[PDB]
Amino acid sequence: LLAEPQIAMFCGRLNMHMNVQNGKWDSDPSGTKTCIDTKEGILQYCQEVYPELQITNVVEANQPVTIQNWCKRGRKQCKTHPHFVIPYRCLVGEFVSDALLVPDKCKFLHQERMDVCETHLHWHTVAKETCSEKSTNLHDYGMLLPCGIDKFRGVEFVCCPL
């Protein structure tokens, strides 16, 4: 969901966050906060930047975005080269899994491993690998059953014809 709460980082520039009202990337309120290394720190920035929301978890978005107007410290020189970055989604309150679009001719699948607690990458790879086994393409996917910070017990996905 391209306009939901989320943050985007580019080291050397101020963090961006999604403006849910207009869909645009807004720079850091303080004019000082830059890129973060830990998922836990990303959760903390989510919480700081969306004070009216209860941020309970985070997850990688599935596709990178392009952002060109990164600000330097103190919010000026807010132009640089276009930069590809995968935003982190700031997940709100009780977990609701993504409603995936399933084009005609494609197939919705889901797998749950209630005995494991796994990464976004792992589930992405499970999804992709499943589709590939039948000569189809992974089209859209989402996490299921959070069990930790950016850790989940399952994946929902859509496989489409090549």
Side-chain angles (χ1 to χ4, degrees), residues 43-65:
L43 174 63
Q44 278 172 331
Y45 187 73
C46 277
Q47 292 170 337
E48 193 190 6
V49 138
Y50 297 100
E52 2 67 58
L53 298 181
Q54 183 194 14
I55 315 292
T56 51
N57 209 337
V58 301
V59 67
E60 285 87 356
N62 289 353
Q63 297 311 329
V65 69

PDB file of all heavy atoms in Angstrom, residues 43-65:
ATOM      1  N   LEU A  43      11.756   0.742  14.082  1.00  0.00           N
ATOM      2  CA  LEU A  43      10.498   0.789  14.817  1.00  0.00           C
ATOM      3  C   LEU A  43      10.413   2.055  15.661  1.00  0.00           C
ATOM      4  O   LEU A  43       9.373   2.704  15.704  1.00  0.00           O
ATOM      5  CB  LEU A  43      10.333  -0.442  15.703  1.00  0.00           C
ATOM      6  CG  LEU A  43       9.117  -0.432  16.630  1.00  0.00           C
ATOM      7  CD1 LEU A  43       7.822  -0.393  15.842  1.00  0.00           C
ATOM      8  CD2 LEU A  43       9.152  -1.627  17.565  1.00  0.00           C
ATOM      9  N   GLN A  44      11.516   2.414  16.309  1.00  0.00           N
ATOM     10  CA  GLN A  44      11.528   3.597  17.154  1.00  0.00           C
ATOM     11  C   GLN A  44      11.334   4.881  16.362  1.00  0.00           C
ATOM     12  O   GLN A  44      10.649   5.794  16.815  1.00  0.00           O
ATOM     13  CB  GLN A  44      12.791   3.643  18.017  1.00  0.00           C
ATOM     14  CG  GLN A  44      12.667   2.788  19.271  1.00  0.00           C
ATOM     15  CD  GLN A  44      13.957   2.665  20.048  1.00  0.00           C
ATOM     16  OE1 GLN A  44      15.045   2.728  19.479  1.00  0.00           O
ATOM     17  NE2 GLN A  44      13.844   2.488  21.356  1.00  0.00           N
ATOM     18  N   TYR A  45      11.919   4.953  15.171  1.00  0.00           N
ATOM     19  CA  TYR A  45      11.723   6.128  14.328  1.00  0.00           C
ATOM     20  C   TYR A  45      10.285   6.205  13.812  1.00  0.00           C
ATOM     21  O   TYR A  45       9.699   7.290  13.754  1.00  0.00           O
ATOM     22  CB  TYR A  45      12.711   6.159  13.164  1.00  0.00           C
ATOM     23  CG  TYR A  45      12.644   7.446  12.380  1.00  0.00           C
ATOM     24  CD1 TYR A  45      13.144   8.631  12.907  1.00  0.00           C
ATOM     25  CD2 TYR A  45      12.062   7.478  11.119  1.00  0.00           C
ATOM     26  CE1 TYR A  45      13.067   9.815  12.196  1.00  0.00           C
ATOM     27  CE2 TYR A  45      11.984   8.650  10.396  1.00  0.00           C
ATOM     28  CZ  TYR A  45      12.492   9.813  10.938  1.00  0.00           C
ATOM     29  OH  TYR A  45      12.411  10.969  10.206  1.00  0.00           O
ATOM     30  N   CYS A  46       9.729   5.059  13.436  1.00  0.00           N
ATOM     31  CA  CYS A  46       8.316   4.962  13.082  1.00  0.00           C
ATOM     32  C   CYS A  46       7.452   5.560  14.181  1.00  0.00           C
ATOM     33  O   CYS A  46       6.533   6.332  13.914  1.00  0.00           O
ATOM     34  CB  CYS A  46       7.907   3.502  12.889  1.00  0.00           C
ATOM     35  SG  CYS A  46       8.270   2.784  11.269  1.00  0.00           S
ATOM     36  N   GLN A  47       7.752   5.181  15.418  1.00  0.00           N
ATOM     37  CA  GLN A  47       6.960   5.602  16.564  1.00  0.00           C
ATOM     38  C   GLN A  47       7.091   7.096  16.807  1.00  0.00           C
ATOM     39  O   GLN A  47       6.119   7.763  17.165  1.00  0.00           O
ATOM     40  CB  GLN A  47       7.365   4.790  17.798  1.00  0.00           C
ATOM     41  CG  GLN A  47       6.964   3.325  17.672  1.00  0.00           C
ATOM     42  CD  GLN A  47       7.543   2.410  18.740  1.00  0.00           C
ATOM     43  OE1 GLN A  47       8.570   2.703  19.360  1.00  0.00           O
ATOM     44  NE2 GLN A  47       6.886   1.269  18.938  1.00  0.00           N
ATOM     45  N   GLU A  48       8.286   7.627  16.576  1.00  0.00           N
ATOM     46  CA  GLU A  48       8.519   9.053  16.780  1.00  0.00           C
ATOM     47  C   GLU A  48       7.845   9.913  15.720  1.00  0.00           C
ATOM     48  O   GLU A  48       7.305  10.983  16.014  1.00  0.00           O
ATOM     49  CB  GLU A  48      10.006   9.377  16.811  1.00  0.00           C
ATOM     50  CG  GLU A  48      10.230  10.774  17.326  1.00  0.00           C
ATOM     51  CD  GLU A  48      11.631  11.252  17.166  1.00  0.00           C
ATOM     52  OE1 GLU A  48      12.451  10.539  16.544  1.00  0.00           O
ATOM     53  OE2 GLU A  48      11.910  12.358  17.676  1.00  0.00           O
ATOM     54  N   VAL A  49       7.880   9.427  14.488  1.00  0.00           N
ATOM     55  CA  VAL A  49       7.380  10.153  13.334  1.00  0.00           C
ATOM     56  C   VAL A  49       5.852  10.043  13.132  1.00  0.00           C
ATOM     57  O   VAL A  49       5.231  10.900  12.495  1.00  0.00           O
ATOM     58  CB  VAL A  49       8.203   9.732  12.093  1.00  0.00           C
ATOM     59  CG1 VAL A  49       7.340   9.527  10.883  1.00  0.00           C
ATOM     60  CG2 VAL A  49       9.310  10.736  11.846  1.00  0.00           C
ATOM     61  N   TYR A  50       5.244   9.018  13.721  1.00  0.00           N
ATOM     62  CA  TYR A  50       3.789   8.869  13.711  1.00  0.00           C
ATOM     63  C   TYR A  50       3.198   8.817  15.124  1.00  0.00           C
ATOM     64  O   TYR A  50       2.663   7.789  15.537  1.00  0.00           O
ATOM     65  CB  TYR A  50       3.384   7.607  12.952  1.00  0.00           C
ATOM     66  CG  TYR A  50       3.756   7.603  11.484  1.00  0.00           C
ATOM     67  CD1 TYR A  50       4.887   6.925  11.034  1.00  0.00           C
ATOM     68  CD2 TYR A  50       2.973   8.263  10.549  1.00  0.00           C
ATOM     69  CE1 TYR A  50       5.228   6.912   9.690  1.00  0.00           C
ATOM     70  CE2 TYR A  50       3.308   8.258   9.208  1.00  0.00           C
ATOM     71  CZ  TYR A  50       4.427   7.576   8.782  1.00  0.00           C
ATOM     72  OH  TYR A  50       4.744   7.572   7.442  1.00  0.00           O
ATOM     73  N   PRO A  51       3.277   9.936  15.861  1.00  0.00           N
ATOM     74  CA  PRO A  51       2.866   9.930  17.272  1.00  0.00           C
ATOM     75  C   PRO A  51       1.380   9.656  17.488  1.00  0.00           C
ATOM     76  O   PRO A  51       1.005   9.174  18.546  1.00  0.00           O
ATOM     77  CB  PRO A  51       3.225  11.345  17.741  1.00  0.00           C
ATOM     78  CG  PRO A  51       3.199  12.162  16.508  1.00  0.00           C
ATOM     79  CD  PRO A  51       3.732  11.270  15.439  1.00  0.00           C
ATOM     80  N   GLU A  52       0.540   9.952  16.506  1.00  0.00           N
ATOM     81  CA  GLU A  52      -0.893   9.679  16.651  1.00  0.00           C
ATOM     82  C   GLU A  52      -1.252   8.233  16.367  1.00  0.00           C
ATOM     83  O   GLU A  52      -2.424   7.865  16.429  1.00  0.00           O
ATOM     84  CB  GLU A  52      -1.745  10.580  15.753  1.00  0.00           C
ATOM     85  CG  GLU A  52      -0.972  11.521  14.879  1.00  0.00           C
ATOM     86  CD  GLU A  52      -0.177  10.807  13.817  1.00  0.00           C
ATOM     87  OE1 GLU A  52      -0.767  10.065  13.010  1.00  0.00           O
ATOM     88  OE2 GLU A  52       1.048  10.985  13.808  1.00  0.00           O
ATOM     89  N   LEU A  53      -0.251   7.420  16.041  1.00  0.00           N
ATOM     90  CA  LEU A  53      -0.480   6.019  15.726  1.00  0.00           C
ATOM     91  C   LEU A  53       0.247   5.081  16.695  1.00  0.00           C
ATOM     92  O   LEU A  53       1.334   5.404  17.196  1.00  0.00           O
ATOM     93  CB  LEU A  53      -0.037   5.739  14.295  1.00  0.00           C
ATOM     94  CG  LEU A  53      -0.732   6.469  13.144  1.00  0.00           C
ATOM     95  CD1 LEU A  53      -0.152   6.022  11.816  1.00  0.00           C
ATOM     96  CD2 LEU A  53      -2.220   6.232  13.167  1.00  0.00           C
ATOM     97  N   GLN A  54      -0.363   3.930  16.975  1.00  0.00           N
ATOM     98  CA  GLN A  54       0.295   2.890  17.771  1.00  0.00           C
ATOM     99  C   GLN A  54       1.096   1.965  16.861  1.00  0.00           C
ATOM    100  O   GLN A  54       0.530   1.056  16.265  1.00  0.00           O
ATOM    101  CB  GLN A  54      -0.724   2.062  18.562  1.00  0.00           C
ATOM    102  CG  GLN A  54      -0.067   1.012  19.464  1.00  0.00           C
ATOM    103  CD  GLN A  54      -1.034  -0.040  19.999  1.00  0.00           C
ATOM    104  OE1 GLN A  54      -2.165  -0.169  19.526  1.00  0.00           O
ATOM    105  NE2 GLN A  54      -0.580  -0.808  20.979  1.00  0.00           N
ATOM    106  N   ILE A  55       2.395   2.217  16.715  1.00  0.00           N
ATOM    107  CA  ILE A  55       3.236   1.355  15.875  1.00  0.00           C
ATOM    108  C   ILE A  55       3.728   0.149  16.656  1.00  0.00           C
ATOM    109  O   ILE A  55       4.466   0.285  17.630  1.00  0.00           O
ATOM    110  CB  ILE A  55       4.461   2.081  15.293  1.00  0.00           C
ATOM    111  CG1 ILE A  55       4.075   3.452  14.746  1.00  0.00           C
ATOM    112  CG2 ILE A  55       5.111   1.215  14.220  1.00  0.00           C
ATOM    113  CD1 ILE A  55       3.221   3.406  13.541  1.00  0.00           C
ATOM    114  N   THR A  56       3.323  -1.033  16.214  1.00  0.00           N
ATOM    115  CA  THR A  56       3.610  -2.252  16.948  1.00  0.00           C
ATOM    116  C   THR A  56       4.641  -3.141  16.273  1.00  0.00           C
ATOM    117  O   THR A  56       5.225  -4.001  16.913  1.00  0.00           O
ATOM    118  CB  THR A  56       2.338  -3.070  17.167  1.00  0.00           C
ATOM    119  OG1 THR A  56       1.672  -3.221  15.915  1.00  0.00           O
ATOM    120  CG2 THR A  56       1.403  -2.370  18.147  1.00  0.00           C
ATOM    121  N   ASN A  57       4.874  -2.934  14.985  1.00  0.00           N
ATOM    122  CA  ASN A  57       5.838  -3.758  14.263  1.00  0.00           C
ATOM    123  C   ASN A  57       6.334  -3.045  13.007  1.00  0.00           C
ATOM    124  O   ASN A  57       5.842  -1.962  12.668  1.00  0.00           O
ATOM    125  CB  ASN A  57       5.222  -5.117  13.914  1.00  0.00           C
ATOM    126  CG  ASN A  57       6.258  -6.235  13.825  1.00  0.00           C
ATOM    127  OD1 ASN A  57       7.437  -5.984  13.599  1.00  0.00           O
ATOM    128  ND2 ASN A  57       5.812  -7.475  13.997  1.00  0.00           N
ATOM    129  N   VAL A  58       7.329  -3.633  12.343  1.00  0.00           N
ATOM    130  CA  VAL A  58       7.800  -3.107  11.061  1.00  0.00           C
ATOM    131  C   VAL A  58       8.031  -4.236  10.060  1.00  0.00           C
ATOM    132  O   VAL A  58       8.283  -5.368  10.441  1.00  0.00           O
ATOM    133  CB  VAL A  58       9.103  -2.265  11.180  1.00  0.00           C
ATOM    134  CG1 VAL A  58       8.905  -1.080  12.103  1.00  0.00           C
ATOM    135  CG2 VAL A  58      10.258  -3.114  11.645  1.00  0.00           C
ATOM    136  N   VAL A  59       7.952  -3.910   8.779  1.00  0.00           N
ATOM    137  CA  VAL A  59       8.267  -4.870   7.732  1.00  0.00           C
ATOM    138  C   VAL A  59       8.772  -4.160   6.480  1.00  0.00           C
ATOM    139  O   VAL A  59       8.335  -3.061   6.167  1.00  0.00           O
ATOM    140  CB  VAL A  59       7.059  -5.794   7.401  1.00  0.00           C
ATOM    141  CG1 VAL A  59       5.934  -5.021   6.772  1.00  0.00           C
ATOM    142  CG2 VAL A  59       7.488  -6.936   6.488  1.00  0.00           C
ATOM    143  N   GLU A  60       9.712  -4.780   5.781  1.00  0.00           N
ATOM    144  CA  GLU A  60      10.147  -4.261   4.493  1.00  0.00           C
ATOM    145  C   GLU A  60       8.966  -4.169   3.533  1.00  0.00           C
ATOM    146  O   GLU A  60       8.098  -5.037   3.525  1.00  0.00           O
ATOM    147  CB  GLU A  60      11.224  -5.164   3.881  1.00  0.00           C
ATOM    148  CG  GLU A  60      12.614  -5.051   4.499  1.00  0.00           C
ATOM    149  CD  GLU A  60      12.809  -5.956   5.705  1.00  0.00           C
ATOM    150  OE1 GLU A  60      11.847  -6.634   6.124  1.00  0.00           O
ATOM    151  OE2 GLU A  60      13.933  -5.988   6.233  1.00  0.00           O
ATOM    152  N   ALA A  61       8.913  -3.097   2.746  1.00  0.00           N
ATOM    153  CA  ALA A  61       8.032  -3.053   1.582  1.00  0.00           C
ATOM    154  C   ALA A  61       8.601  -4.019   0.554  1.00  0.00           C
ATOM    155  O   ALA A  61       9.762  -4.418   0.652  1.00  0.00           O
ATOM    156  CB  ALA A  61       7.952  -1.651   1.010  1.00  0.00           C
ATOM    157  N   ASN A  62       7.794  -4.391  -0.429  1.00  0.00           N
ATOM    158  CA  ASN A  62       8.194  -5.436  -1.355  1.00  0.00           C
ATOM    159  C   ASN A  62       8.926  -4.927  -2.573  1.00  0.00           C
ATOM    160  O   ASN A  62       9.557  -5.700  -3.287  1.00  0.00           O
ATOM    161  CB  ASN A  62       6.987  -6.257  -1.797  1.00  0.00           C
ATOM    162  CG  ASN A  62       6.451  -7.128  -0.699  1.00  0.00           C
ATOM    163  OD1 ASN A  62       7.047  -7.231   0.374  1.00  0.00           O
ATOM    164  ND2 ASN A  62       5.323  -7.774  -0.962  1.00  0.00           N
ATOM    165  N   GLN A  63       8.815  -3.631  -2.830  1.00  0.00           N
ATOM    166  CA  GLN A  63       9.477  -3.043  -3.980  1.00  0.00           C
ATOM    167  C   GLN A  63      10.173  -1.770  -3.582  1.00  0.00           C
ATOM    168  O   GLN A  63       9.703  -1.055  -2.712  1.00  0.00           O
ATOM    169  CB  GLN A  63       8.478  -2.740  -5.108  1.00  0.00           C
ATOM    170  CG  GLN A  63       7.769  -3.957  -5.701  1.00  0.00           C
ATOM    171  CD  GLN A  63       8.726  -5.075  -6.075  1.00  0.00           C
ATOM    172  OE1 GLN A  63       9.882  -4.832  -6.441  1.00  0.00           O
ATOM    173  NE2 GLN A  63       8.248  -6.312  -5.979  1.00  0.00           N
ATOM    174  N   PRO A  64      11.300  -1.477  -4.232  1.00  0.00           N
ATOM    175  CA  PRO A  64      11.957  -0.199  -3.980  1.00  0.00           C
ATOM    176  C   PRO A  64      11.134   0.961  -4.538  1.00  0.00           C
ATOM    177  O   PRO A  64      10.216   0.769  -5.342  1.00  0.00           O
ATOM    178  CB  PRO A  64      13.287  -0.331  -4.729  1.00  0.00           C
ATOM    179  CG  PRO A  64      13.032  -1.353  -5.777  1.00  0.00           C
ATOM    180  CD  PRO A  64      12.033  -2.305  -5.204  1.00  0.00           C
ATOM    181  N   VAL A  65      11.458   2.157  -4.075  1.00  0.00           N
ATOM    182  CA  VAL A  65      10.867   3.377  -4.585  1.00  0.00           C
ATOM    183  C   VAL A  65      12.023   4.286  -5.009  1.00  0.00           C
ATOM    184  O   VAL A  65      13.163   4.049  -4.608  1.00  0.00           O
ATOM    185  CB  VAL A  65       9.995   4.047  -3.505  1.00  0.00           C
ATOM    186  CG1 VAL A  65      10.859   4.592  -2.364  1.00  0.00           C
ATOM    187  CG2 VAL A  65       9.149   5.140  -4.106  1.00  0.00           C
TER     188      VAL A  65
END
